[PDB]
Design a protein around this ligand. Structure first.
Ligand SMILES: CCCCCCCCCCCCCCCCCC(=O)OC[C@H](CO[C@@H]1O[C@H](CO[C@H]2O[C@H](CO)[C@H](O)[C@H](O)[C@H]2O)[C@H](O)[C@H](O)[C@H]1O)OC(=O)CCCCCCCCCCCCCCCCC
Ligand code: CLA
Ligand code: CLA
Ligand code: CLA
Ligand code: CLA
Ligand code: CLA
Ligand code: CLA
Ligand code: CLA
Ligand SMILES: CC1=C(/C=C/C(C)=C\C=C/C(C)=C/C=C/C=C(C)/C=C/C=C(C)/C=C/C2=C(C)CCCC2(C)C)C(C)(C)CCC1
Ligand SMILES: CC1=C(\C=C/C(C)=C\C=C/C(C)=C/C=C/C=C(C)/C=C/C=C(C)/C=C/C2=C(C)CCCC2(C)C)C(C)(C)CCC1
Ligand code: OEC
Ligand SMILES: [Fe+2]
Lengths: 28, 36, 35, 170, 447, 98, 242, 335
């Protein structure tokens, strides 16, 4: 049943790296 | 149906395959943050 | 009519061979400024 | 389908130019679009010929000369001019469409191109002569018998198991 | 490499073709999704796999391959070990991390230029030898397992062989093929109906037997290029540019993918049907078989039954081989599978056999294949174009053969656009056409 | 000198009302308590009957089978064998499926 | 000794079994032995269409025709009890087997004449006072020839016999009569009549081969055209067993 | 001369021969010359063909009773299907004739040389020195022609079912298909009819605007079209006054100022949709037919509510049933 909630986190795992990168710095 | 002792994870096993795709997706999120 | 069978090949081969031997002689030349 | 099946539109000259124009035009579009892109003067710097273009002033971006001398040798013909090229593209479609609108006008008063006597008259005898026309026309005849009853409900059509046309097998 | 001094965003990866690739890591980066994908789907597959339900009836694209290798199957196409399947995906999946864990690095924190760190073979495309030598490695690399398989085929467990004596069953390839006429002969074989140069393959003896020949043949190439520099008609002929290299290389896939799509739709040997669906032709032949029986069993003479058209319902005649099932089914008189071969004859289908030696184990396999046919909608409602929603099933072959074609097609589109742009550097007009020095505005007018 | 369709006409004999032992498709045999399966294979096989009863005297018929036929005799009829109806072993598979 | 994978493609399965020149050795028939035939095969080669003679009444002709449908011609796998009736002659009554190959030869002109080469419901007999099958022996008897097409069959435009549109159809207010020929589809039934002379016999094997000549009719086409006569020639094998 | 071939070598690659003939040329040029020749005749005068698995000859030659529309040179028979039926494999010339062997010749030939034209479509963009993402546009076309003549056949096993070369033939190949693939309900064909319709709309759009902001150079007696000379240095249209209009006509920003982009949009739209389409056929080639929602909408009791697609399907059966009457000797059209 649960399947959905656990998918949620992984999906927002990627844009979160973008966010954690916005704040800190680098990449550019 | 995975080995009995894994019963707990049918939920994730369920999603794992979507990921591949997910990458072409993200590739955009970044390109957008980096104003192209 | 087994004749035809061969009469063609040659006509086909000839060409296929003329095809390859034309591209074989490398075409990096035969354009603007032979480069 | 309903047209194909009852009006057998597919075989109506007018509709034909209708696809002759849409279809014919699409090519015309896809080609002028690409034909142009390739005969583009490198007038920018690098891998972005999309920016190198001047929104500001007149400067033929696609050598009209590298054009004709291309197809003239690859297809035998040259669209020498751009007023006509960029015009003939207006025509192609719009025209066909009309030829469609005419055609259908026909279908309005059931004036349709199903006919083709020359054939059907000789279709009577020679039970062994067969063209696609007939072979096709037959498909239609099935499309009727099967859908009419449910498509046209207000007629409360009723077709017993038997009356329905079918080949040996299904 | 930032924007300017690069391409636009959609041509992103082009700025990586500049200097020495900052990351091999890209390629490795995904060289992981590809292996991870096996890790997910394989897990996902078994994650949904029931042992009774016919493997092809449960959207199993991935799992059937393990089986075809002898794993978790044995007698009939029955699955005894739910374990082995699980194993392989679990491994790959996890295996992917290392592949991605590294590609992910090589692309951001390592040498943004391995052209300089060079040393180790290193980087630069025009470098005619670094490339001959590189592919050279990946050549020993492939042939490597060509044997890996031969091993599984000859030393670890065997493969699944539908032809195999008894019946479909995990068997060990004892005696692979020697004779080069055979193993090679296929290439020289007809391309059209009756004999596909690659596709036509009755047994494993010729498969694993042929693979062997390829491992060494392929290794002999890596060993080869690794040691030498390409000749002068080679250089003369082919443009050398990083891109141009992809250009060729890419059109080996295109072709190859078709060669797959065209293969997964046609063979019962390397694609058993006990794991994939019954092959298209097999189907409309299976139908035949089922009804030849239905009536013969109902009391009809069959063999001597004049059919509606003028041909005969149950039995008909082909031009070269004399006897086969007749319907519209004829197109597939080339179909060969263990479920119909016993009832075969010198001249073709034997009337005496078909009449009395046609056993039960066939009427039931024949009926499964009549039903389960490669026919379905994206909707996934397996059946004729116009069937009611209920029984749904889409043959692994449908998806397999279909996809690869669209992709392999598209790739051919690639082989073009990457050759089209690369053959362009060759003279420099790839960026465009120089406004003051164009070959045409200075040439003898055609007339 | 007035040629006419044969099946259409024989549809006008008793063939259209009941089951024709000598012509009728073997498919119309299910429509009665336990006849189709085997009895039919014998009904259909076994020569063409001149009399509707000669059915009962069929080689090897079973003491029970014999009975059945008797019982169902009501619905069986006959007309000249119809070349157009029997040729092509159509009687076994007329080309008519659901 | 040949496998299907060995013979397929040769277009051989359409040509049937030979008997090498160790023949002329008659087969010992009993009169005390039941005897049956095993796969009697008729492979053909010569199709002649009796030319619809022009109105003039001087010897109608038998022109030679070109084969069209490649190899779909020969017929065999025919079996039937071989009766040994009084006066010691043999009669072979075929019970079933592949025997109705549909062929279409191209006439002198451009005509496409299609017939149904067949030796069905066959009852062939030989000469009397024969205790042995040899180059002497021969077989003559009758046929049964239905029609090219079955009962169902829809000629383009939908017409048919045991089904089919039933009429002029395409033409609604057309003149009903004169299309009778086309609409009502009659179904033919006619006699064949072959002739079998042996030429190579093996004494033990029961095998015997020879030339044959069938004279039958062509395609009735429901009613279309009056059929054309046809003579058929070729060699035939036919193994005999007890 | 050192070798006489030297001249053959520059001629083939003559960047100035009235009609360029590349290396592809040397194959294209005749592959079509033979292909066409067989065709033009087969139409004008060619016997019927047993097409379908039986012996029902379908006539398709003007001299055999065809209107230009009914005209068509027919396929190879279900007898051959995929086997290669070249002119020599057939005994009598007439065999090849009857069993429909012209098809393969015509089809195989053009269907081949066609591609070489695709190559020689670019070979001139190399000798001429112009960007060459042009030859690709041509793909979509050739893909389809290949799809309707080579994939689908390999898909169903017989050249029998490959869009018969002729007008009314296509119509046939079509109506049948719908029936066996519900193509019309297929997501691909959609994206196909998508662009085609588009391109045909854009082809009239971009052609519309240009002529609408054409520029000055004429009287009213003179033909406005005359205002231009081949080899102009500056384009004839006033792009600014064009976008300045079209842009405005609903949204202003859904418009193109980037002539390079626009002319490009024209390229790719038609050329991309057409591809999907070409793939659509090639997709259903192995039976991944269009969608299917028959009986997919139902009420409580289960009484079934017809979907507007059930009609689609109704008219579909009418088609399924008839097509190829006589051969189909079994319940399921498994081919
Ligand atoms: C002879 C000269 C011909 C000149 C033609 C020149 C034209 C130029 C080429 C362009 C396209 C035409 C070329 C034809 C290639 C297609 C293959 C084909 O038609 O031949 C058909 C065969 C099919 O093999 C089948 O093989 C079967 C055997 O299997 C059977 O028997 C087997 C054992 O024998 C097994 O038991 C098995 O289970 C059982 O099913 C049967 O014999 C069938 O009759 C037989 O059809 O395919 C194969 O093996 C061949 C596989 C080749 C790879 C092709 C990939 C897919 C094709 C894509 C085309 C690319 C063009 C695209 C351009 C447009 C944009 C891209
Ligand atoms: C065989 C493998 C292969 C490899 C390694 C490459 C590699 C490359 N190709 Mg390429 N190509 C291939 C096959 C390949 N191609 C094939 C088979 C075709 C036929 C179509 C092409 C056609 C093609 C074109 C036209 C171009 C390239 C380009 C490139 C280069 C740019 C990199 C790139 O595009 O990333 C970036 C990835 C993208 C931009 C993907 C996004 C695409 C956009 C336009 C659409 C977005 C999709 C969207 C709808 C997804 C929905 C998400 C939703 C949630 C909103 C790169 C070297 C570009 C170049 O010039 O290189 C020299 C270029 O212009 N390729
Ligand atoms: C599909 C696979 C793929 C791969 C392997 C690459 C790889 C690359 N692209 Mg790229 N690209 C892609 C698709 C891809 N691209 C597509 C589809 C588009 C169209 C939008 C682009 C558009 C594009 C542009 C415009 C540019 C690149 C550039 C690059 C290079 C710079 C990488 C970088 O700076 O990341 C920076 C990374 C971040 C800012 C954060 C991302 C975090 C990632 C790397 C980690 C994710 C790992 C995963 C989530 C978890 C694993 C963790 C592990 C420890 C277990 C690199 C070689 C640049 C280039 O030119 O290189 C020289 C560049 O300018 N790309
Ligand atoms: C080699 C490519 C390939 C092929 C042939 C298949 C085939 C299949 N997959 Mg699958 N899959 C793949 C890659 C592939 N997959 C990848 C990379 C993932 C990870 C995201 C998955 C994740 C996945 C899941 C979760 C499931 C499947 C399932 C299936 C089966 C039914 C799916 C279906 O009917 O919907 C048809 C789907 C479509 C028609 C998508 C429409 C395509 C649009 C978006 C445009 C595509 C254009 C482009 C050219 C094609 C892209 C290629 C593809 C890799 C996306 C079918 C056998 C189902 C199944 O069988 O369960 C066991 C199922 O539940 N797959
Ligand atoms: C897949 C193909 C591939 C190729 C051709 C390379 C090539 C390279 N990698 Mg590499 N790498 C890969 C995959 C690959 N990698 C993957 C999948 C990962 C995931 C981790 C990495 C992670 C990685 C790291 C962290 C580094 C490299 C580095 C390098 C470069 C150093 C070459 C060297 O001398 O190593 C030779 C290595 C061996 C011969 C293997 C020896 C195995 C045993 C004997 C000891 C290895 C240590 C132990 C087993 C585990 C490794 C721990 C790790 C810290 C190395 C070289 C260009 C180095 C670099 O910066 O290059 C400029 C570097 O620091 N790679
Ligand atoms: C894996 C990828 C790969 C790539 C990209 C290359 C690339 C190359 N290899 Mg190579 N090679 C590889 C794998 C690869 N190889 C493997 C796995 C082996 C194992 C041996 C080899 C063994 C090898 C050798 C021995 C040689 C090469 C050579 C070459 C170079 C020239 C090849 C050429 O252009 O052929 C173009 C050839 C043709 C277009 C042939 C046209 C002539 C036709 C008509 C042949 C006639 C057909 C005949 C009748 C038989 C059947 C015909 C038909 C009916 C089928 C080129 C750089 C050559 C090189 O210079 O150095 C190695 C070379 O001598 N390779
Ligand atoms: C990203 C989308 C995608 C997905 C999910 C798949 C998935 C699959 N492909 Mg595939 N493929 C793709 C894109 C994709 N492909 C593209 C773009 C091409 C080029 C046109 C191909 C060409 C191709 C071929 C020729 C074959 C596959 C096969 C397969 C299946 C077995 C995987 C495999 O071979 O493992 C590891 C490798 C094998 C099991 C067999 C290797 C074949 C030998 C070594 C020849 C070379 C292999 C091939 C060229 C490398 C591609 C491997 C693949 C993982 C990309 C699997 C369902 C195989 C199949 O049909 O099912 C068994 C197969 O024979 N593919
Ligand atoms: C250089 C160009 C390039 C780019 C930008 C990418 C990008 C990506 N690849 Mg990839 N790949 C490439 C070349 C490239 N690849 C090559 C040459 C191979 C050799 C096989 C692969 C093999 C591969 C595998 C096995 C996998 C990826 C995956 C991915 C990621 C998910 C998309 C995917 O399905 O990939 C696979 C193949 C493709 C993505 C090819 C095209 C598929 C996309 C473009 C279809 C969806 C958008 C498209 C249909 C837009 C339509 C056009 C629109 C205008 C209508 C994505 C980051 C992972 C993935 O997520 O797959 C599910 C994954 O598992 N790739
Ligand atoms: C859990 C886990 C994991 C993780 C992972 C990952 C890494 C994932 C991912 C992820 C991701 C990372 C995904 C994705 C992505 C992305 C995204 C989320 C995106 C986005 C979105 C969107 C919606 C967008 C949109 C848009 C638009 C609007 C248009 C265009 C542009 C863009 C794209 C921006 C794995 C699997 C390894 C396994 C182990 C554990
Ligand atoms: C695209 C790209 C990117 C990235 C990345 C890539 C490309 C790649 C890769 C790769 C990757 C990303 C990889 C990986 C990985 C890892 C993984 C995938 C993992 C894992 C693991 C898992 C998943 C597991 C799980 C489990 C276990 C552990 C066992 C049991 C079962 C379970 C499930 C629990 C970006 C965007 C940045 C850009 C550039 C390129
Ligand atoms: Mn021409 Ca493909 Mn419907 Mn079975 Mn036929
Ligand atoms: Fe324009």
């Amino acid at each position: 049943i649960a399947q959905l909630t656990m998918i949620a986190m992984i999906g927002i795992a990627g844009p979160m790296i973008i966010f954690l990168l916005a704040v800190r710095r680098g990449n550019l | 149906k995975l080995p009995e002792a894994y019963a707990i994870f049918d939920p994730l096993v369920d999603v794992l395959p979507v990921i591949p795709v997910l990458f072409f997706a993200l590739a955009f999120v970044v390109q957008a943050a980096v104003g192209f | 009519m087994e004749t035809l069978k061969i009469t063609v090949y040659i006509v086909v081969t000839f060409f296929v061979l003329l095809f390859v031997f034309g591209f074989l002689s490398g075409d990096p030349a035969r354009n603007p400024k032979r480069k | 389908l309903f047209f194909q099946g009852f009006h057998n539109w597919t075989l109506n000259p007018f509709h034909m130019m209708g696809v002759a124009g849409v279809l014919g035009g699409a090519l015309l579009c896809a080609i002028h679009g690409a034909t142009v892109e390739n005969t583009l003067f490198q007038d920018g710097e690098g891998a972005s010929t999309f920016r190198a273009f001047n929104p500001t002033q007149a400067e033929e971006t696609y050598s009209m000369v590298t054009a004709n001398r291309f197809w003239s040798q690859i297809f035998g013909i040259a669209f020498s001019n751009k007023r006509w090229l960029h015009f003939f593209m207006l025509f192609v479609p719009v025209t066909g469409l009309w030829m469609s609108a005419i055609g259908v006008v026909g279908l309005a008063l059931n004036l349709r191109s199903y006919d083709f006597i020359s054939q059907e008259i000789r279709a009577a005898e020679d039970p062994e002569f067969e063209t696609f026309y007939t072979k096709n026309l037959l498909l239609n005849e099935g499309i009727r018998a099967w859908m009419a009853p449910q498509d046209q409900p207000h007629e409360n059509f009723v077709f017993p198991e038997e009356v329905l046309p079918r080949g040996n097998a299904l | 490499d930032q924007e300017s001094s690069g391409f636009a965003w959609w041509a992103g990866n082009a700025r990586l073709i500049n200097l020495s690739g900052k990351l091999l890591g890209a390629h490795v980066a995904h060289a992981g999704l590809i292996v991870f994908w096996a890790g997910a789907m394989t897990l996902f597959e078994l994650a949904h796999f029931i042992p009774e339900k016919p493997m092809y009836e449960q959207g199993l694209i991935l799992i059937p391959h393990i089986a075809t290798l002898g794993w978790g199957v044995g007698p009939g196409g029955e699955v005894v070990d739910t374990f082995p399947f699980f194993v392989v995906g679990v491994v790959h999946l996890i295996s992917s991390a290392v592949l991605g864990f590294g590609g992910v690095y090589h692309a951001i924190r390592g040498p943004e230029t391995l052209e300089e760190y060079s040393s180790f073979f290193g980087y630069d495309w025009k470098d005619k030898n670094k490339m001959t030598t590189i592919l050279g490695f990946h050549l020993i690399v492939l042939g490597i397992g060509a044997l890996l398989l031969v091993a599984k085929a000859m030393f670890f467990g065997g493969l699944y062989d539908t032809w195999a004596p008894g019946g479909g069953d995990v068997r060990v390839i004892t005696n692979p093929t020697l004779d080069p006429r055979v193993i090679f002969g296929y290439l020289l074989k007809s391309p059209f109906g009756g004999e596909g140069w690659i596709v036509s393959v009755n047994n494993l003896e010729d498969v694993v037997g042929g693979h062997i020949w390829i491992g060494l043949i392929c290794i002999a190439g890596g060993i080869w290029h690794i040691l030498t520099t390409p000749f002068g008609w080679a250089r003369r002929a082919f443009i050398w540019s990083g891109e141009a290299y992809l250009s060729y290389s890419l059109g080996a896939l295109s072709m190859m993918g078709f060669i797959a799509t065209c293969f997964v739709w046609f063979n019962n040997t390397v694609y058993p049907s006990e794991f994939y669906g019954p092959t298209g032709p097999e189907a409309s032949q299976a139908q035949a078989m089922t009804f030849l029986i239905r009536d013969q069993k109902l009391g009809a003479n069959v063999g001597s039954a004049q059919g509606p058209t003028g041909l005969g319902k149950y039995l008909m005649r082909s031009p070269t081989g004399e006897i086969i099932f007749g319907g519209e089914t004829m197109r597939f008189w080339d179909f060969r599978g263990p479920w119909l071969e016993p009832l075969r004859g010198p001249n073709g289908l034997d009337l005496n056999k078909i009449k009395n030696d046609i056993q039960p184990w066939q009427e039931r396999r024949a009926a499964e294949y009549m039903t389960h046919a490669p026919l379905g909608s994206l909707n996934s409602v397996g059946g004729v174009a116009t069937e009611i929603n209920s029984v749904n099933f889409v043959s692994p072959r449908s998806w397999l053969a279909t996809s690869h074609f669209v992709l392999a097609f598209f790739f051919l589109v690639g082989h073009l656009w990457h050759a089209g742009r690369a053959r362009a550097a060759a003279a420099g007009f790839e960026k465009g056409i120089d406004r003051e020095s164009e070959p045409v505005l200075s040439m003898p007018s055609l007339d | 000198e007035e040629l006419v369709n044969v099946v259409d006409e024989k549809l006008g004999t008793a063939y259209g009302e009941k089951i024709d032992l000598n012509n009728t498709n073997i498919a119309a045999f299910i429509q009665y308590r336990g006849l189709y399966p085997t009895l039919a294979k014998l009904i259909v096989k076994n020569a063409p009957y001149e009399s509707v009863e000669d059915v009962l005297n069929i080689p090897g018929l079973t003491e029970r089978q014999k009975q059945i036929l008797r019982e169902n005799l009501e619905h069986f009829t006959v007309t000249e064998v119809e070349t157009a109806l029997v040729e092509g072993g159509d009687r076994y598979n007329n080309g008519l499926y659901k | 000794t040949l496998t299907y994978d060995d013979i397929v493609g040769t277009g051989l399965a359409n040509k049937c079994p030979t008997l090498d020149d160790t023949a002329r050795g008659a087969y010992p028939i009993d009169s005390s032995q039941t005897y049956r035939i095993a796969r009697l095969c008729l492979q053909p080669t010569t199709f002649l269409v009796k030319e619809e003679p022009k109105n003039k009444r001087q010897e109608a002709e038998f022109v030679p025709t070109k084969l069209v449908t490649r190899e779909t011609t020969s017929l065999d796998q025919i079996q039937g009890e071989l009766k040994v009736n009084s006066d010691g002659s043999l009669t072979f009554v075929e019970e079933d087997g592949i025997d109705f190959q549909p062929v279409t030869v191209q006439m002198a002109g451009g005509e496409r004449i299609p017939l149904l080469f067949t030796v069905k419901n066959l009852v062939a007999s030989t000469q009397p006072n024969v205790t042995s099958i040899t180059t002497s022996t021969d077989f003559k008897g009758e046929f049964n020839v239905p029609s090219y097409r079955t009962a169902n069959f829809l000629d383009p435009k939908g017409r048919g016999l045991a089904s089919g549109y039933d009429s002029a159809i395409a033409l609604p207010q057309a003149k009903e009569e004169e299309l009778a020929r086309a609409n009502v589809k009659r179904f033919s039934l006619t006699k064949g009549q072959i002739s079998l002379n042996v030429a190579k016999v093996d004494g033990r094997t029961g095998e015997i081969a020879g030339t044959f000549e069938s004279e039958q009719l062509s395609d009735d086409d429901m009613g279309a055209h009056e059929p054309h006569e046809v003579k058929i020639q070729g060699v035939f094998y036919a193994s005999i067993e007890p | 001369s050192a070798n006489l071939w030297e001249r053959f070598c520059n001629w083939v690659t003559s960047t100035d021969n009235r009609l360029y003939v590349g290396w592809f040329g040397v194959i294209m040029i005749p592959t079509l010359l033979a292909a066409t020749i067989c065709f033009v005749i087969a139409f004008i005068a060619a016997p019927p063909v047993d097409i379908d698995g039986i012996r029902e000859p379908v006539s398709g030659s003007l001299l055999y009773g065809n209107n230009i529309i009914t005209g068509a040179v027919v396929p190879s028979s279900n007898a051959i299907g995929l086997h290669f039926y070249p002119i020599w494999e057939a005994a009598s010339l007439d065999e090849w004739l009857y069993n429909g062997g012209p098809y393969q010749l015509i089809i195989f030939h053009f269907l081949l040389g066609a591609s070489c034209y695709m190559g020689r479509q670019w070979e001139l963009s190399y000798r001429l020195g112009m960007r060459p993402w042009i030859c690709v546009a041509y793909s979509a076309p050739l893909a389809s022609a290949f799809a309707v003549f080579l994939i689908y056949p390999i898909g169903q096993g017989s050249f029998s079912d490959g869009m018969p070369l002729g007008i009314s033939g296509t119509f046939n190949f079509m109506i049948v298909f719908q029936a066996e693939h519900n193509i019309l309900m297929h997501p691909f064909h959609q994206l196909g009819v998508a662009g085609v319709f588009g391109g045909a709309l854009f082809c009239a759009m971009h052609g519309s605007l240009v002529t609408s902001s054409l520029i000055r150079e004429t009287t009213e007696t003179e033909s406005a079209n005359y205002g231009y000379k081949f080899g102009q240095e500056e384009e004839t249209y006033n792009i600014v006054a064009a976008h300045g209009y079209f842009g405005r006509l609903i949204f202003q920003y859904a418009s193109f100022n980037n002539s390079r982009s626009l002319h490009f949009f024209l390229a790719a739209w038609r050329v991309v949709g057409v591809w999907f389409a070409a793939l659509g056929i090639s997709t259903m080639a192995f039976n991944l037919n269009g969608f299917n929602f028959n009986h997919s909408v139902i009420d409580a009791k289960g009484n079934v509510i017809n979907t507007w697609a059930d009609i689609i399907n109704r008219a579909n059966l009418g088609m399924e049933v008839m097509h190829e009457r006589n051969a189909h000797n079994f319940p399921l059209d498994l081919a």
